[PDB]
């Protein structure tokens, strides 16, 4: 009876398996035979796929998990800067003259230093302007057992500023939500006074050890002027991001 590739030494079978898409490895290859199941559930296969794809930043909480999280790491918010218009944003509250998308640097505002692929921002008016996204975590590639057991870091970031010729206010509320959309964790800023001098500010929060059951991230933020003028003198928001960290 002839069995060649199969009696292949493990490090060499690993090289063959590493060539395959993680997705097939987990779904088809695992189901071939017990030797393959054990390899696919092991560290070395995935440690190999990680170093092969430059992901390596000895041991791990799960090398397979590291791999999927690393490959899948991306901003989960649609249209964070206004390049589409208000597209992708929901529960949009247009207070005063509403949100208006504008080009950087603003009229009486500072440049966006921290990343210069960012070219636009959303400007608020003289009543509260708000907008939100609800991110479905499984839809984005984060499976239940990862969410309930690993509970990987959910990183949330936002950028706000105001005009140098007008006072303004900013608000951010990020919620972790159950399958049923009950609230399991909440990061709220309260009302923040935007810097006087029009400098861009970054607000950042990482959710870790958040317990089991997290299925959605609700990102909400808002702005308004504190001088009550017609036009768009309120807080400017851009470059909002949400991602899961490997």
């Amino acid at each position: 009876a002839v069995e060649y590739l199969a009696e292949l030494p493990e490090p060499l079978l690993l090289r063959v398996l590493a060539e395959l898409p993680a997705t097939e490895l987990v779904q088809a290859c695992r189901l071939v035979c017990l030797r393959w199941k054990e390899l696919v559930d092991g560290a070395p296969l995935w440690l190999l796929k990680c170093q092969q794809e430059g992901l390596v930043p000895e041991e791990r909480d799960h090398w397979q998990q590291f791999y999927f999280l690393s490959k899948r790491r991306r901003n989960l918010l649609r249209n964070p800067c206004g390049e589409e218009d208000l597209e992708g944003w929901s529960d949009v509250e247009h207070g005063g003259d509403g949100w208006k998308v504008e080009e950087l640097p603003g009229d009486n505002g500072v440049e966006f230093t921290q990343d210069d692929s960012v070219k636009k921002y959303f400007a608020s008016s003289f009543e509260w302007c708000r907008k939100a996204q609800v991110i479905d975590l499984q839809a984005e590639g984060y499976w239940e057992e990862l969410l309930d057991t690993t509970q990987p870091a959910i990183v949330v970031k936002d950028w706000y500023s105001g005009r140098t010729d007008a006072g303004s206010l900013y608000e951010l509320t990020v919620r972790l939500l159950s399958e049923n959309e009950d609230v399991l964790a909440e990061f709220a800023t309260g009302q923040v006074a935007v810097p006087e001098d029009g400098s861009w500010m970054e607000i950042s929060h990482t959710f870790i050890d958040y317990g089991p059951g997290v299925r959605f991230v609700r990102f909400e933020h808002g702005g308004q002027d504190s001088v009550y003028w017609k036009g768009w003198f309120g807080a400017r928001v851009t470059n909002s991001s949400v991602w899961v960290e490997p």
Partner: protein
């Protein structure tokens, strides 16, 4: 600019120290004894195809078109080839030959891969599939 090689089954092969340099294990065989260099783990048939691949890649993803026709060998010899490549430490041959076997598994069902590689259905309990994990 010329070096003699001896396979497991006695046979001698002559090749330039230039193409016989891609094999890192025998490239390290200039120093440490510099009357062929004995290769106990490769037979003559395989050592031939090994120098042949190396004389095509003297100088020097999707895998080159020649290598594809070159690796149009039977299954047993592919196995022999990845072992030779690993034995001789020709990184290029190993990558391409493992790639070739991988392509045999690509997109196939468990049943289909057991058939093409004559692996037995090992499982004792119900084969429950995992998706993304």
């Amino acid at each position: 600019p010329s070096i003699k090689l001896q396979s497991s089954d006695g046979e001698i092969f002559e090749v330039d120290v230039e193409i016989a340099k891609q094999s890192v294990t025998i490239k390290t065989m200039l120093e440490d004894l510099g009357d062929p260099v004995p290769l106990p783990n490769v037979n003559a048939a395989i050592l031939k195809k090994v120098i042949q691949w190396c004389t095509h890649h003297k100088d020097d993803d999707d895998i080159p078109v020649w290598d594809q026709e070159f690796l149009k060998v039977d299954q047993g010899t592919l196995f022999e080839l990845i072992l030779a490549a690993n034995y001789l430490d020709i990184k290029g041959l190993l990558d391409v030959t493992c790639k070739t076997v991988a392509n045999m598994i690509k997109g196939k069902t468990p049943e289909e891969i057991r058939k093409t590689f004559n692996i037995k259905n090992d499982f004792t309990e119900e084969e429950e599939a995992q998706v993304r994990k």
